[PDB]
Amino acid sequence: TTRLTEPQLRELAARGAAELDGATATDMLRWTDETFGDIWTTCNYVVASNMADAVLVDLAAKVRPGVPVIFLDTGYHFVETIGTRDAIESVYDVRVLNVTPEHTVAEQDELLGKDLFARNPHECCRLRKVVPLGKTLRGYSAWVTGLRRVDAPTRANAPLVSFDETFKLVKVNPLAAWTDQDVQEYIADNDVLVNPLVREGYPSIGCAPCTAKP
Ligand code: SF4
């Protein structure tokens, strides 16, 4: 494998969380790149995005050109989300990776009942998001997400750096301390791309069947 050892990863996550207490998003990404950078697509840390905007993508490309960015194409996405994905891949200096489940929508419908998302959403999410994400992250020692502590009351204590137990690696959230005004001013000052559905009155953007219509 190409993963770092579990105790090594836990100690690195602890040292990073202690050392980056109160750092800006760029400082966290700089530390991540300095730690897991070598030994441009030949990288040891990856960035994850839901294609709702290109804030974290812009930052990661500014600190590391050609950085890999994973997108979980569950086959239930909006056409606008796939269009935003393509736009970010064409514009930004980023290596995009289309993480797809091994079974298509039609295949899963025929093998486990049509529209499995409506009959059991947890298993659909596990099959099309969690399992492919884990199979892809096997190989990377750390991964970066655009999680903000304001996303939910349960996310209020989201750490800057920690050890993700679900995939057993290092998880760093640069946008954790960011507020809505923060991301708004950043998008304004940097002219970064935004999913059209966000402009069309959508709080969050996920799979088409499991997104609350306004
Ligand atoms: S959000 Fe809905 S459609 Fe998308 S993977 Fe989860 S259960 Fe399936």
From Swiss-Prot:
Transmembrane regions: none
Q: Name one GO biological process term.
A: hydrogen sulfide biosynthetic process
Enzymatic reactions: [thioredoxin]-disulfide + sulfite + AMP + 2 H(+) = adenosine 5'-phosphosulfate + [thioredoxin]-dithiol
Report the InterPro entries cross-referenced here.
APS_reductase (IPR011798), PAPS/APS_Rdtase (IPR004511), PAPS_reduct_dom (IPR002500), Rossmann-like_a/b/a_fold (IPR014729)
Q: Per the annotation, how and in what number is the cofactor bound?
A: Binds 1 [4Fe-4S] cluster per subunit.
**UniProt superkingdom:** Bacteria
Compartments it resides in: Cytoplasm
Q: Which residues bind [4Fe-4S] cluster?
A: C124, C125, C207, C210
The UniProt keywords, alphabetically, are: Cytoplasm, Iron, Iron-sulfur, Metal-binding, Oxidoreductase
Task: Cite the GO molecular-function annotations of the record.
Answer: 4 iron, 4 sulfur cluster binding; adenylyl-sulfate reductase (thioredoxin) activity; metal ion binding; phosphoadenylyl-sulfate reductase (thioredoxin) activity
**Which pathway is this protein engaged in?**
Sulfur metabolism; hydrogen sulfide biosynthesis; sulfite from sulfate
One GO cellular component term noted in the UniProt record for this chain: cytoplasm
**EC code:** 1.8.4.10
Q: Which cofactor does it need?
A: [4Fe-4S] cluster
Q: SUPFAM superfamilies of this UniProt entry? A: Adenine nucleotide alpha hydrolases-like
* Role according to the record: Catalyzes the formation of sulfite from adenosine 5'-phosphosulfate (APS) using thioredoxin as an electron donor.
Q: Which family does it belong to?
A: Belongs to the PAPS reductase family. CysH subfamily.
Q: What is this protein called?
A: Adenosine 5'-phosphosulfate reductase
